[PDB]
Amino acid sequence: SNTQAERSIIGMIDMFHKYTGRDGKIEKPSLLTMMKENFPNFLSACDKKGIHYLATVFEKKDKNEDKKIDFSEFLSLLGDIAADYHKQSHGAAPCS
Amino acid sequence: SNTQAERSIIGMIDMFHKYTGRDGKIEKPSLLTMMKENFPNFLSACDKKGIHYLATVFEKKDKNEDKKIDFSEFLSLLGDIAADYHKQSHGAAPCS
Ligand SMILES: [Ca+2]
Ligand SMILES: [Ca+2]
Ligand SMILES: [Cl-]
Ligand SMILES: [Cl-]
Ligand SMILES: [Zn+2]
Ligand SMILES: [Zn+2]
Ligand SMILES: [Zn+2]
Ligand SMILES: [Zn+2]
């Protein structure tokens, strides 16, 4: 009944919920597990480029500095990953 | 080799590319076809709420007013759809 694009959006909300606490936001250790579980090939390409994405991702995406990642900040992180994959689709090297 | 989350991101880039012109941006008639093809259940829920999402989506998401939707603006639209589905996941009515 749902399209592939709709199930994809629903899958990202289901993913977010695997990592949220009772406040519906993601703490730092949880974010890093989410990245390692769901974006391992993304992370691996950075580490080759000499980049430890995990060292800064929490602090960079915690825009309101409340030491949580909320849904809006989580979407911003997915956007970032999407931008990298789009660049790759055009012959760019991973994690630039 | 790619995770489900990675294939989902790749699927959204593949979707974007179904609708772009030679300049790598999406014109209005194309955006509306993309919505109707990929988010029909989203759109249907709006039309019930008396909302014609298609009447304004192009103009609302064309942030730089160049009459194209570029990748960054397309991600912003997916974010919007994601926000609605997240709200739904918490008992909110579709298209609020
Ligand atoms: Ca925050
Ligand atoms: Ca534009
Ligand atoms: Cl939540
Ligand atoms: Cl493009
Ligand atoms: Zn939630
Ligand atoms: Zn696992
Ligand atoms: Zn492209
Ligand atoms: Zn079709």
| CB within 8 Å: A6 and B79 | no
Q: Spell out which residues of chain B touch residue A1, defining contact as CB-CB under 8 Å.
A: 41
Q: What is d(CA A26, CA A22) in angstroms, rounded to the nearest whole number?
A: 9
CA distances from B39 to A6, A95, B27 (A): 6, 30, 17
CATH code of the domain occupying B1-96: 1.10.238.10
Q: What is d(CA A84, CA B39) in angstroms, rounded to the nearest whole number?
A: 24
Listed by start position, the domains of chain A span 1-96
| Both structure tokens of B90 | 């918490």
Say what angle helices B71-89 and A71-89 make with each other, to 10 degrees.
140
Largest Cα separation within chain B, whole Å, is 44
Rg (CA), chain B: 14
Q: What is d(CA B61, CA B73) in angstroms, rounded to the nearest whole number?
A: 6
Residue A3, chain B, CB below 8 Å: the answer is yes
Spatial contact of A81 and B11, defined as CB atoms under 8 Å apart: no
| CB within 8 Å: B3 and A40 | yes
CA distances from B28 to B18, B61, B68, B79 (A): 14, 11, 7, 19
Q: How many CA atoms lie within 13 A of B19 on its CB side?
A: 24
Q: What is d(CA A32, CA B32) in angstroms, rounded to the nearest whole number?
A: 37
Residue B3, chain A, CB below 8 Å: the answer is yes
Q: Percent helix, strand and coil across chain B, each rounded to 5?
A: 65, 0, 30
Tell how far the Cα of B49 is from the centroid of ligand 3, in angstroms: 24
* Way it was determined: X-ray
**Residue B87 DSSP SS3:** helix
Q: Which of A6, A72, A79 sits opposite B75 (nearest CB)?
A: A79
Q: Spell out which residues of chain A touch residue B82, defining contact as CB-CB under 8 Å.
A: 9, 12-13, 75
CA distances from B89 to A8, A62, B86, B93 (A): 14, 23, 5, 9
A51: Cβ contacts below 8 Å, ≥ 6 apart: A95
| Both structure tokens of A24 | 């519906």
DSSP states along A24-76: S-B-HHHHHHHHHHH-HHHHHHHHHTT--GGGTHHHHH-TT-SSSB-HHHHHH
The candidate with the shortest Cα–Cα distance to B81, out of B35, B47, B50, is B35
Resolution to 1 decimal, in Å?
A: 1.7
B53 Cα to chain A: minimum distance (Å): 16
DSSP states along A54-68: GGTHHHHH-TT-SSS
A4 Cα to chain B: minimum distance (Å): 7
Q: What is d(CA B24, CA B16) in angstroms, rounded to the nearest whole number?
A: 9
Q: Which of B2, B6, B85 sits opposite A13 (nearest CB)?
A: B85
